[PDB]
């Protein structure tokens, strides 16, 4: 029969040189990391405006006004080192020492952005 945004002091902004910092993540969930301007919104999506440049591994996408598939995703217990050079306006991301690749076969993530008033670290 409700994401949380974290950053540094706006006074720590940089206008020249090469700056590099590490971001460790013991999980592999929704996390964005990059550098924003001292006008970033603490409630809007990190990168969705002209005030931040981030990267999200949950979809392997660089974040700007729009999203473009960039780099590869991470796993639980990883680190990512972000480097940006102001002499050439070049943003770089390295997942566990492995430099990230875009779709066009270029290690560069972001290019040709105005220096503005500075870039402060930010995570989401």
Curated annotation (Swiss-Prot):
Channel activity is modulated by phosphorylation. Phosphorylation is increased in failing heart, leading to calcium leaks and increased cytoplasmic Ca(2+) levels. Cytosolic calcium-activated calcium channel that mediates the release of Ca(2+) from the sarcoplasmic reticulum into the cytosol and thereby plays a key role in triggering cardiac muscle contraction. Aberrant channel activation can lead to cardiac arrhythmia. In cardiac myocytes, calcium release is triggered by increased Ca(2+) cytosolic levels due to activation of the L-type calcium channel CACNA1C. The calcium channel activity is modulated by formation of heterotetramers with RYR3. Required for cellular calcium ion homeostasis. Required for embryonic heart development. It comes from the Eukaryota. Highly expressed in heart, lung, cerebellum and brain. Detected at lower levels in adrenal gland, stomach, thymus, esophagus and ovary. The calcium release channel activity resides in the C-terminal region while the remaining part of the protein resides in the cytoplasm. Residues 1-124 form the B30.2/SPRY domain. Belongs to the ryanodine receptor (TC 1.A.3.1) family. RYR2 subfamily. Homotetramer. Can also form heterotetramers with RYR1 and RYR3. Interacts with CALM and S100A1; these interactions regulate channel activity. Identified in a complex composed of RYR2, FKBP1B, PKA catalytic subunit, PRKAR2A, AKAP6, and the protein phosphatases PP2A and PP1. Interacts directly with FKBP1B, PKA, PP1 and PP2A. Interacts with FKBP1A and FKBP1B; these interactions may stabilize the channel in its closed state and prevent Ca(2+) leaks. Interacts with SELENON. Identified in a complex, composed of FSD2, CMYA5 and RYR2. The chain holds residues 1062 to 1206 of 4966 of the full protein. It is found in: Sarcoplasmic reticulum membrane. This is Ryanodine receptor 2. Disruption phenotype: Embryonically lethal. Embryos die at about 10 dpc, due to defects in heart tube development. Cardiac myotubes display enlarged rough endoplasmic reticulum and cytoplasmic vesicles that contain high levels of Ca(2+).
